[PDB]
Design a protein around this ligand. Structure first.
Ligand SMILES: Nc1ncnc2c1ncn2[C@H]1C[C@H](O)[C@@H](COP(=O)(O)O)O1
Length: 276
């Protein structure tokens, strides 16, 4: 599977200059979505923050003073919404850090980030940078879409940072996101690959880099009435951590499509979109 070098080549977007640096990368990013399934940006300093987060997640996975004390089924959820907290092994381990969890929105939901406060501080930092980046990546996609295209309205409380441990050859079968957009963050190991428009595979060179990928999710495919296919991807590995931000709109908001240039408010909510 051909390797795709990105560090040195993707637009550069600086932590202290995100709004400006993303405006200046609009043209590049559009051409990526058009040329590849997906989009890419180099964010100098993101690598160090993501490696430190992931390393502290691993440590916490083996700690027993335990993450499973905050398994999804014992953490307060929101009435309507997705499910945040730790998902035990029996993606192998994995945690979902929502914006609600960061703000103790269901009071008691941020208790994992208080039990493991070093991973929590780093995960809250990574969430905030990744949400800013993903919302500006979505304004680029909206600008490639017909006039009248509404704002994506990505919700901070519904967005989740997934951090995975242990993800013997194929670690994923080909998959895409349910949600509007994903931000892939530089993983520990190489293996994540994307399908191109020609139906061939590339392996982004992203392990141990400052490169983030942005993924089209099936909600956006639906709202763009087919014009943007999901950024379908898989993971191959050779005898291990990873994290990705899944941006959702508010569950209770009405779905919408741009069909041949016309905006159509639908009956079903984005909530209903997930419940298949
Ligand atoms: N085992 C497992 N559980 C959950 N999500 C996974 C898993 N493997 C891959 N994914 C990812 C990839 C997609 O966005 C998304 C599907 O949402 P979903 O919540 O699955 O409808 O979750």
């Amino acid at each position: 599977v051909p390797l795709m070098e990105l560090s040195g080549r993707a637009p550069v977007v600086r932590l202290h200059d995100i709004e400006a640096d993303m405006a200046a990368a609009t043209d590049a990013i559009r051409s990526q979505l058009t040329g590849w399934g997906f989009m890419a940006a180099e964010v100098p300093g993101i690598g160090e923050r993501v490696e430190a987060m992931m390393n502290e997640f691993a440590a916490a996975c083996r700690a027993t003073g335990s993450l499973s004390d905050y398994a999804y089924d014992v953490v307060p959820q929101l009435a309507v919404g997705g499910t945040h907290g730790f998902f035990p092994y029996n993606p192998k381990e994995f945690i979902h850090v929502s914006g609600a969890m960061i703000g103790d929105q269901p009071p008691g939901a941020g208790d994992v980030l208080r039990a493991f406060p070093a991973f929590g501080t780093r995960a809250a930092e990574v969430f905030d940078i990744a949400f800013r980046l993903i919302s500006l990546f979505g304004e680029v996609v909206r600008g490639m879409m017909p006039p009248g295209t509404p704002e994506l309205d990505l919700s901070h409380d519904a967005t989740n940072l997934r951090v995975i441990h242990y993800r013997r050859e194929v670690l994923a079968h080909e998959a895409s996101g349910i949600q509007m957009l994903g931000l892939q963050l530089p993983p520990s190991d190489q293996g994540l690959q994307y399908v191109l428009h020609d139906g061939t595979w590339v392996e982004p060179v992203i392990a141990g880099t400052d490169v983030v990928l942005c993924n089209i999710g099936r909600m956006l495919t639906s709202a763009s009435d087919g014009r943007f296919r999901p950024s379908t991807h898989r993971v191959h590995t050779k005898p291990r951590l990873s994290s990705v931000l899944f941006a959702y709109p508010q569950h209770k908001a009405r779905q919408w499509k741009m069909v041949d240039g016309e905006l159509m408010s639908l009956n079903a909510t984005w909530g209903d979109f997930i419940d298949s």
